RNA sequence: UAUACGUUAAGUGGAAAAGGAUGUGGAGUUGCUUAGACAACCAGGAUGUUGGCUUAGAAGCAGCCACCAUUUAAAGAGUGC
């Protein structure tokens, strides 16, 4: 059991792992909004990037 | 509407506590202190260093260790914004 038992919800953690990192996309975004932080409005929804 | 010496001002006097309080007057103790104190005002309040760690960034000021040394009149690797 032990064996197979956290074999299997360990392999679960990992199939629900997989899905989502949602961090460095928006972080980079983040400091590039840092470094043109003097063409802002707060009352925008889109950006110009490099 | 006595005499003399001080008190209080709350009408306490003339209703009461915990507790509060730069209230008050009295004594008394004790460091600063007319080479001038304290305050105010004026001048400065710097350097390696943004101390290093971590942090995307932590740059006195998210958090961890450090908290040194120098110009020095003295300025903290920072007291708070």
Do not use: C, H, P, W
């Amino acid at each position: 059991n032990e064996r197979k038992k956290n074999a299997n919800k360990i392999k679960k953690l990992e199939k629900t792992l997989e899905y989502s990192e949602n961090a460095k996309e928006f972080q980079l975004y983040g400091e590039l909004l840092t470094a043109n932080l003097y063409m802002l409005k707060k009352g925008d929804k889109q950006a110009e990037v490099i």
